Amino acid sequence: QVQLQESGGGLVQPGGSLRLSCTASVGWYRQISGKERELVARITDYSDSVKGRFTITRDNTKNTVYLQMNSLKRGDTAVYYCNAEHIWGQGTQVTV
Amino acid sequence: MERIKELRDLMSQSRTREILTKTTVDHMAIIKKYTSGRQEKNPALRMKWMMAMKYPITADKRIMEMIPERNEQGQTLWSKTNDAGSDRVMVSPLAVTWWNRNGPTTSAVHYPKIYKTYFEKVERLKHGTFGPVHFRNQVKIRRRVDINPGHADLSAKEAQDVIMEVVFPNEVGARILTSESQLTITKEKKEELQDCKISPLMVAYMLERELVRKTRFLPVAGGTSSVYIEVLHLTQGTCWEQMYTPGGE
Amino acid sequence: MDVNPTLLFLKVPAQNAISTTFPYTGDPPYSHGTGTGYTMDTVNRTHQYSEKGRWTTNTETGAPQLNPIDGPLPEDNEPSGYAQTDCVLEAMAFLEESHPGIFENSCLETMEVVQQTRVDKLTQGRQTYDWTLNRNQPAATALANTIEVFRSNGLTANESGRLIDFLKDVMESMDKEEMEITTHFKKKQRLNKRSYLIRALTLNTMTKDAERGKLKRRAIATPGMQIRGFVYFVETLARSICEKLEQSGLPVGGNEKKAKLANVVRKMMTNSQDTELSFTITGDNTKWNENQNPRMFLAMITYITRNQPEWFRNVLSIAPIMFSNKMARLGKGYMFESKSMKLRTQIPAEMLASIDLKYFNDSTRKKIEKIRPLLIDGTASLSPGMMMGMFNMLSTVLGVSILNLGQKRYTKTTYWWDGLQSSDDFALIVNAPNHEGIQAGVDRFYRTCKLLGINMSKKKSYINRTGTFEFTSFFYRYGFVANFSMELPSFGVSGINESADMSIGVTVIKNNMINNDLGPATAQMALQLFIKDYRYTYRCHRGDTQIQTRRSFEIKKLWEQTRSKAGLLVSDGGPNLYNIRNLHIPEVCLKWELMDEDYQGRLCNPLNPFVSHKEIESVNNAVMMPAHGPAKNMEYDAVATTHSWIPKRNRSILNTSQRGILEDEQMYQKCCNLFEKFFPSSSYRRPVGISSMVEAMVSRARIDARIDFESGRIKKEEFAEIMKICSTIEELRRQ
Amino acid sequence: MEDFVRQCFNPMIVELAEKAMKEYGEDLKIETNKFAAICTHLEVCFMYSDFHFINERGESIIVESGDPNALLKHRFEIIEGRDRTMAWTVVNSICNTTGAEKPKFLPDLYDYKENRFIEIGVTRREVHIYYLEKANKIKSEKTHIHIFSFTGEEMATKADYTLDEESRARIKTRLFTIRQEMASRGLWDSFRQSERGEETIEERFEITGTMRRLADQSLPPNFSSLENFRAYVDGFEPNGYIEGKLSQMSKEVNARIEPFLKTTPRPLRLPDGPPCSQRSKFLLMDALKLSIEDPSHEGEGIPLYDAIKCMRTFFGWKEPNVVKPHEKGINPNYLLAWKQVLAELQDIENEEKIPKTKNMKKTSQLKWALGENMAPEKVDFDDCKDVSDLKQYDSDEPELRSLASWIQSEFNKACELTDSSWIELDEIGEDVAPIEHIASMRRNYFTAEVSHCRATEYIMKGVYINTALLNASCAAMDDFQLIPMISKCRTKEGRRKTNLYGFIIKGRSHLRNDTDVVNFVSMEFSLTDPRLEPHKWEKYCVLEIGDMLLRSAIGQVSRPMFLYVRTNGTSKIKMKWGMEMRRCLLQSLQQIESMIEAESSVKEKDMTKEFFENKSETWPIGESPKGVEEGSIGKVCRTLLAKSVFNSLYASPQLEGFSAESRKLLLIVQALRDNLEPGTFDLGGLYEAIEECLINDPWVLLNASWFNSFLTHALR
RNA sequence: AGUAGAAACAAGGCC
RNA sequence: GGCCUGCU
């Protein structure tokens, strides 16, 4: 019914910025090594760990949900997954 | 015979004898309303809560000698445990339905004659003729109108003496009704209800309702007639008018 | 997309969809425990709004009383109870001048009523604080107990059967050295003068439940029986007065209120020319009852009753005299819990005077510390102001005087104002040639209100242009708009009985269609839902279903027995024939022609053991406490059927020391039934006289045996038997 | 003079006359000659009536003493000697039985032979004037009148004297005994003329004694007595006293109007704290349904058998294990309770006929889960005063909690359509009037719109659950009871179906007050993993109980299937109000019908059909990141129904307070938008009144967020 | 524990 | 263990 394609992951330095996107054809979750999958943002609603640092936006016209991540820290190192209401993307690595 | 006999039996016991002796007639009402039962604040909640019990209603003791204690499968119909502050016994709701399927039967032909107002309403509606519904803004203006369509041009007190003389001819006292309209009403309602055995109190209440004029303030648009106000809910609305002509006309 | 109903107001005006803003589909807030905290808070608040008054100690009750009347004028917008005697007397004088003959006439009718009123009128009231037992009891029970105590003490003027004589006895009781009361645990206890004075001047405090529209709970009060007659007379006078005032809206219903509001707004705006601007203030009064001093009501009534018989003035003045010295019982008490030892305790409120303050929190500790000086014999003196709207009508009179004081003849300025007042709520239409004029007019109205001990709630009030306003949950927007959310709680089974519930439900649907502009399809849906709930509540299902219940067997056999099953009542598991056209017809009469004669006779049988009728007042009257309003009574059309049973009573009296009340109830009811069989008109018209029961009963036995022989069943043998049995009961009453 | 009535007359007559004296309320000490005269009248009445009997013939039998027999009939039966009420009772009874005419005044006796009344009066004056006097007092009278007078003479009309003459000799001997006994006394200076018909009284209500002193302490500060204050009031006249105090009063006492503009209103502040948790008594958005496709109706059937049959329809059961703990309770108790429920369900399945209602064993597991024997024992204060821990019940403002995004999504999906019809309405009288046809068509349209709505499913769930819980509490007060959550719907194909969400175990429910709490434990199947929104399930314990396979194009999902288990509670009032959730349908559809009628008052025609089919007109019913979104009338119906359902589900005092204090501000904002120059006296006070209602309830916080969004979109 | 929210329930009393 | 009450 919906298929979800993520993009924009990778390797970034402490204090840096990174921009994820999800094309659907809605929110972002992350899972750190040995930890449970946590909500990052959904569209707005935001985890306390990322408030004032990460901003989620949604273009309904193009069914696309961008996540702008600023002021990145080593504790934000995770696999980041898009979700749409549940359908999940494949997951994109973010390494700070 | 009987009446004076339970009178003597009551006077036999000291407490009831004292109550009968020291209590004056005027205090009749007070002691009759003397009760420990508070008036319920939330009737719906407890009616929905009591009906889930066994033996939730109350009935006179005589029920114990007209209805069997149990039905075919053994569901109990009444209990012998009396109410809190009365000699009546608590009984189950089935004892009602049982009374409607095997209880004693009578001749209810005179109930239409007693409940004149309701049957007149039914007759008026049965022969009514409806019309097209017209959709247009209705200017509802608030007016004082008479709701009772059978009022005989009498007030509460004015017709109360008539009602007593019709039902309780001996307790009238000084009053002997002067107006001849009251004379004819007394004659008619006396010969009509000469042997009706429903109850003196209900007969008096319904005569009061029928003869006494009553008035209330309501938002009306058109109509204004007594027969046209009882169906005010069906003929007038917020944006629609339903032409109607009761059976009387 | 996120759904948001409130955004609907961006297209539909607020008043056209105001019903959405009334969450009357859920359980209303209830209080759980004691109301003592609220009572203490109210007492302290009433006493501190008048702190700048003068203190005195009553020589009779020995309680401290605070008189703020003629006190320093307020210098802030906070609530103040410093009413000025001269200002209020002048306001009443102007009210009389604008309505000549109002006071004299109203006093004349009140004098007629007072001198022809009876004692039994006091029984027609809800719970009252009986001082014989120090608890709330039904009005009739408390009246009977007080009469018994008075007769035992030697005050027997009430035997005249006149309420004025009962009040004479009540006042004479105030001058007695030692009265005697009865207590069960029977013990005879002696009350001295001061203790009886305080017991007669005290009020019982409870917590108001089922109050929708506020986060916090409030406290309400119930007076005794000694003071209710004076209150009745004073309220009769006030009602007779307000009925002559078109600016009042308290003694009328809702539709009359709407009509008067429309008339006043049209009068104010229409008469205003193009040059004059008009503004409506939707005002609520903060702490209305706490700032109304009974002494000022005494002043108003003594001005009203000028040039009248002195006895009338005295009897009408007794009430505010007692309210000025009124005491309030703190309440049920306080319950403590100890989790370490895992126990709970309940201390009565009367211990608050001496109990240490280690158990109470900071707020309650401070409240008790502040209220202790006013504690006298377990009750707190509450002289400064009224507790809970006992003098509603006099307060409305004062508000109407304020409203009329701006008729442009007393303003002496271009601006002027009018409006409608109903205690604690008002709508004020003020016109003036310019915004400065409107501001000056509203300022002067507020200032004059503060001179009469009346405060305007600035937080719950707002002013706009005329054409849109609110009044007691009635929203006017170029014409009143229906709400239908205030009457939603009344769409279920009332809880009286089967026939009564059916008739009440259909009649409520009809009325809300007539008044609250309920739609046809909505009314049909309401009928369907009400029928469903009615069948599911009384276990009376259609009969053709297989829903097993405790009553599904007898219903099913009655169904299979009946031939014309369309005539069966819904109470007996029959089809529902109701519709928009049939909402004004009782169920029995609507199905009369369809019933089988056997079932019809079994149903409407006078000899049924279920139907019980007590008095003409309780035949077809049901007391339904409406949501957001005072308790109200409704006439419901119903036919006396076997379904008109009355439900079971509480039955918890059996575990209390007050267990003998049930035996007295049974004996009184037996005697009353015997009298009714002797005097059939006992119920319809309450008998009057000064003789005793047995005299009337035996003498009527004599005469009825006589005449019923002169034609009837009796025989000489039986007639003589009755005559000598009457003689026997005569000699028995001798000894 | 009273010494005469002390001496001669018998007690019976003197107390009869004393009660007649009390009758009309005049005192005996002022004028006693009336007492003597009327007591002599009463005496002649007796002596004339008694000693006179009749048998089956006429021709009265006269016996000096009534012998023991049934033959004790009295010739003349007395009228007077009774109260006015009874005298008129006898008058009316005689008239109605004898068919005679009713006199307007009081007679004295009745007789059979001549079947009529006797009005005996013996006056001081001679008979031949008093007779016709009382005759012209009585109008057109057939009652025969007979009077004596002291000289000894008798008279009567018709020359009629109704009984023996020796009795009349008796009467006049009695008469002259009276006369020449006063001769020894000497009373005729007034006896002939002592009564003139005085009737006057003044009502006296005198304040005296203690009650007077109280009146002296209920005056303004500078008054000393009620007399002086009343004199001052009577002498008071208006002389411009309000103006003087208005001028002297400080000018800081004002009601200045603060203009209300677009930039004036500020957004309502929401409380901050831990996220808001779930409060509902059952799962709303995460419910799962096990079905059988039976033909039974809503109430038709037996609960336990239907539940077991529905549960047997699912395969894939696994041994339950903890997934998300309660975080405050003992999850192993919940696990053991679930396994116990399964075991006892099988136990019922084995036996002969499924019981209509089952009772469960009271194991320690459900003893803890249902809170049994935890209420502190009630004791007396005199026995527990030295306990330091003894204090009041915790009475403080509830914990503060911030809004979470789950309630918004729950409401969003509570307004969505479904693949079933969750309302099966009852029957109504066949429509006879055209207006009834219009109403029926409108009602059918709304039922088609709202029946396939999650709000209706929630309504039915709540109604059924609360009804069953209340009935079980009232019936099985002591013993824990099992109740399967059942709801019956109808598919698109038309086949009826049952659905089993889970089970409820009701505990001890000895509910006396309307606020007393009955505790139960609720278990509900679901597929929503609780590891994604843990803060919404603070009070739940969630286990893993199986796996479900729903047909999907992605092979087949084989999702996990969890059990949400929690301890909840209700009260009689809450149960009663939750069993009347069907009035949410009313509220909503009344609002929609009011909209339709208001619009149709403009165009003189019913506008329902085009509203529901064309769907051209739309109302703002939500906001998307792109902007405000409008939906058809049906979506408005569903949205209002969901709002009412959530009002009934999350009801609380916070909701009422916020609703009132926000309706005030909504009216002010509407006045602003209508260009009506709104003004306020203290807007900060209103804001503080609104903000104090928002504490921890998810529903009220969501309403406040909606109000802030409406303000942001409005004021433009 | 839970319900609930300015104080309560989580049975009461009587033997 | 036995019995009483569920707005008093």
Residue numbers in the entry:
A (entry chain F): 1 to 25, 34 to 51, 58 to 99, 108 to 118
B (entry chain C): 1 to 249
C (entry chain B): 1 to 185, 207 to 756
D (entry chain A): 1 to 716
What is written in the article reporting this PDB entry?
Central to the replication cycle of influenza viruses is the viral RNA-dependent RNA polymerase which transcribes and replicates the viral RNA genome. The influenza virus RNA-dependent RNA polymerase is a heterotrimeric multifunctional machine composed of polymerase basic 1 (PB1), polymerase basic 2 (PB2) and polymerase acidic (PA) subunits, that catalyzes both primer-independent replication (vRNA to complementary RNA (cRNA) and cRNA to vRNA synthesis) and primer-dependent transcription (vRNA to mRNA synthesis) in the nucleus of infected cells. PB1 houses the polymerase active site, whereas PB2 and PA contain, respectively, cap-binding and endonuclease domains required for transcription initiation by cap-snatching. High-resolution structures of the complete viral polymerase from a number of human, avian and bat influenza A viruses, as well as influenza B, C, and D viruses have been determined. These structures have revealed that the polymerase is a highly flexible macromolecule that can assume a variety of distinct conformations, enabling the polymerase to perform both transcription and replication that require different initiation and termination mechanisms.
Using cryo-EM we determined the structure of 17 polymerase-nanobody complexes at resolutions between 4.5 and 6.7 Å; this is sufficient resolution to accurately position each nanobody bound to the polymerase heterotrimer. Nb8191 binds to the PB1 N-terminus and PA residues 405–420, 531–534, 551–557, and 624–626 (site 4c). Nb8190, Nb8191, Nb8192, and Nb8207 caused a significant reduction in viral titre at most time points tested. Nb8190, Nb8191, Nb8192 and Nb8207 were shown to significantly inhibit viral mRNA synthesis. To probe the effect of nanobodies on this interaction, the binding of purified recombinant 1918 polymerase to a Pol II CTD mimic peptide consisting of four heptad repeats, phosphorylated on serine-5 of the heptad repeats, was measured in an in vitro binding assay. Nb8191 and Nb8192 were found to significantly reduce the binding of the polymerase to the CTD peptide. Quantifying the cRNA from these infections shows that all the selected nanobodies significantly reduced cRNA accumulation.
